[PDB]
């Protein structure tokens, strides 16, 4: 969950305070569905890793 909130906050406007290192990489203003797909890809990565 910490890994999830940290990453998703770097593609959306979330008030969870993170220092941001990848703003110079272009990206869109992620919506609910886009964040959902992104989290889906994140979740499977962790499960297959462990």
């Amino acid at each position: 969950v910490q890994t999830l909130v940290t990453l998703v906050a770097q593609i959306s406007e979330t008030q969870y305070p993170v220092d941001r290192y990848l703003d110079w990489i272009p990206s869109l203003r992620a919506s609910a569905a886009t964040a959902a797909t992104f989290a889906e890809w994140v979740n499977t990565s962790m499960k297959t890793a462990f």
């Binding site: 869109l28 992620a30 919506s31 569905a33 886009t34």
Partner: protein, 50 residues
């Protein structure tokens, strides 16, 4: 578009290309009433995509 204005009381009109001017108001009122009636609907929420 003549056929719209001869729909109410032109039962005596012979020609198909003509209409009686004296029932213009009645035909217009009927047209407006049907215009209102045909639009009595509730808007539906379908779904979006970014």
């Amino acid at each position: 578009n003549i056929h719209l204005f001869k729909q109410l009381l032109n039962t005596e009109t012979l020609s198909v290309r003509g209409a009686n001017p004296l029932m213009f108001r009645a035909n217009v009122l009927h047209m407006l009433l049907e215009f209102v009636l045909d639009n009595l609907y509730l808007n539906r929420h379908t779904g979006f995509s970014q």
